[PDB]
Design an enzyme around this catalytic site. Sequence first.
Site, mmCIF file in Angstrom:
data_model
loop_
_atom_site.group_PDB
_atom_site.id
_atom_site.type_symbol
_atom_site.label_atom_id
_atom_site.label_comp_id
_atom_site.label_asym_id
_atom_site.label_seq_id
_atom_site.Cartn_x
_atom_site.Cartn_y
_atom_site.Cartn_z
ATOM 1 N N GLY A 60 40.718 38.819 46.859
ATOM 2 C CA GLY A 60 41.083 38.648 45.453
ATOM 3 C C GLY A 60 42.591 38.628 45.271
ATOM 4 O O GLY A 60 43.308 38.152 46.164
ATOM 5 N N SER A 61 43.060 39.186 44.142
ATOM 6 C CA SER A 61 44.477 39.240 43.760
ATOM 7 C C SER A 61 45.458 39.780 44.796
ATOM 8 O O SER A 61 46.646 39.436 44.764
ATOM 9 C CB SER A 61 44.657 40.066 42.483
ATOM 10 O OG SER A 61 44.269 39.300 41.370
ATOM 11 N N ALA A 62 44.965 40.637 45.684
ATOM 12 C CA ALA A 62 45.774 41.264 46.700
ATOM 13 C C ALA A 62 46.512 40.279 47.604
ATOM 14 O O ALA A 62 47.446 40.675 48.261
ATOM 15 C CB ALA A 62 44.910 42.191 47.548
ATOM 16 N N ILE A 63 46.082 39.017 47.628
ATOM 17 C CA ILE A 63 46.637 38.015 48.515
ATOM 18 C C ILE A 63 47.768 37.286 47.825
ATOM 19 O O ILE A 63 48.588 36.647 48.476
ATOM 20 C CB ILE A 63 45.571 36.995 49.001
ATOM 21 C CG1 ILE A 63 46.004 36.412 50.344
ATOM 22 C CG2 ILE A 63 45.300 35.907 47.937
ATOM 23 C CD1 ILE A 63 45.200 35.211 50.794
ATOM 24 N N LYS A 64 47.841 37.427 46.506
ATOM 25 C CA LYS A 64 48.792 36.647 45.725
ATOM 26 C C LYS A 64 50.278 36.760 46.124
ATOM 27 O O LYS A 64 50.967 35.725 46.155
ATOM 28 C CB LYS A 64 48.621 36.906 44.223
ATOM 29 C CG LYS A 64 47.409 36.192 43.659
ATOM 30 C CD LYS A 64 46.956 36.740 42.313
ATOM 31 C CE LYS A 64 45.679 36.011 41.895
ATOM 32 N NZ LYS A 64 45.076 36.547 40.635
#
Length: 322
Positions: A60-64
């Site tokens: 999820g968002s953690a890769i952004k």
Amino acid sequence: ALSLDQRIQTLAYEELNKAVEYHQAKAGTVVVLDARTGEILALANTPGRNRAVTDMIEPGSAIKPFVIAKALDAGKTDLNERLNTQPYKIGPSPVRDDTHVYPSLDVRGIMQKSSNVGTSKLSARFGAEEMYDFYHELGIGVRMHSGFPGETAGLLRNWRRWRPIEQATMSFGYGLQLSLLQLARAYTALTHDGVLLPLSFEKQAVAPQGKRIFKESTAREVRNLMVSVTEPGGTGTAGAVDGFDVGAKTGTARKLVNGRYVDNKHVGTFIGFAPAKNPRVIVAVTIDEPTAHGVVAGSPFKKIMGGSLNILGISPTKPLTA
């Protein structure tokens, strides 16, 4: 000479149980790294297998932050560009922020609001093959060979089969998989001045030569931008730690389970590091399928991080308020 710190392990274990019980979740996992050496300081799971190690998740968002870092690193954006962040389409497929609209944001804003639009457009400034290679060099699809049972490589699909919609959804953390430990690992590239560290379970008298991914100054600036996630305005104020600047991401991750029909299990996630400017600790928390009452992974992250910094003799860098 294990790298594990008992004081930190006990703290991780306790706040994890506390959070998992409070939210009535199926399970939970905490990983604590020394942000400069890659030493695993703690690794706690709820009873059962070592999920930190065995469980592939879509991040999820953690890769952004990584997409944004790559775009800054290559000069495909800078700290002054305002991007048009209106929802838009790729073919039929809508891309949208959840569930706000931000007409435009600069890169700080994209990070701050964890914008799907902004991230996916920064990703789209690279070819599929360059993005594939980037995800691979972060260690995605690459076995860590920790020596624990059930470990796997993860999933990074061959770039030749990527649709433009798939490149974009990968940039906001879906369609590729990695374990929590692999994810916490990727975060060392941000904390250790652009240099990815291999991680170790043993105490280190070196510490190790890693592998450059970003310029030092790219990593330094990305860490500053991630502070805006935990400050008012950001999506992760639940992970703020009194006295420190915290760089972090929150998101709902996904865990896939076979077979007749694949089950998309939701996983609350919070990952971050502090003091932001001179990081000393990465903390990653996942909480599997919460049920009652994202503060979900945030509160234990907040407590584990705060407590780890005190345990390690790291002093606040800003005034206390309450």
